[PDB]
Ligand SMILES: [Cl-]
Ligand SMILES: [Cl-]
């Protein structure tokens with residue numbers, strides 16, 4: 266599924282991301298836009314052989330099992346294909362564990378390089394929330 270901007274904002278709010286560990290909703294929408302262009306089916310392979318999955322580009326080296334990343338962990342306890350669902354639940358729940366790990370949203374490279382320190386409230390402007 267390719268979400269609209271406000272549709273995803275609403276979905277993320279309903280799932281408890283607004284101010285989760287102090288990160289306002291617009292941070293999460295901005296991260297999703299630049300990680301996946303709001304497409305739940307997005308995948309990208311990394312140089313190390315791991316792959317990033319779904320709307321928040323969650324990586325198989327640590328967080329999910331794809332059966333092809335040797336030596337990796339599955340800290341979210343989920344197949345990576347669950348992260349590609351039209352239902353963002355699994356992605357959201359795994360993202361909460363990532364953002365709690367110590368480095369906050371700096372785990373998301375696109376967030377660090379394109380969202381951090383910008384006016385992220387712009388991403389939720391006009392939405393009914
Ligand atoms: Cl915001
Ligand atoms: Cl893994």
Ligand SMILES: [Cl-]
Pocket residue numbers: 286368369370
């Ligand atoms: Cl933080």
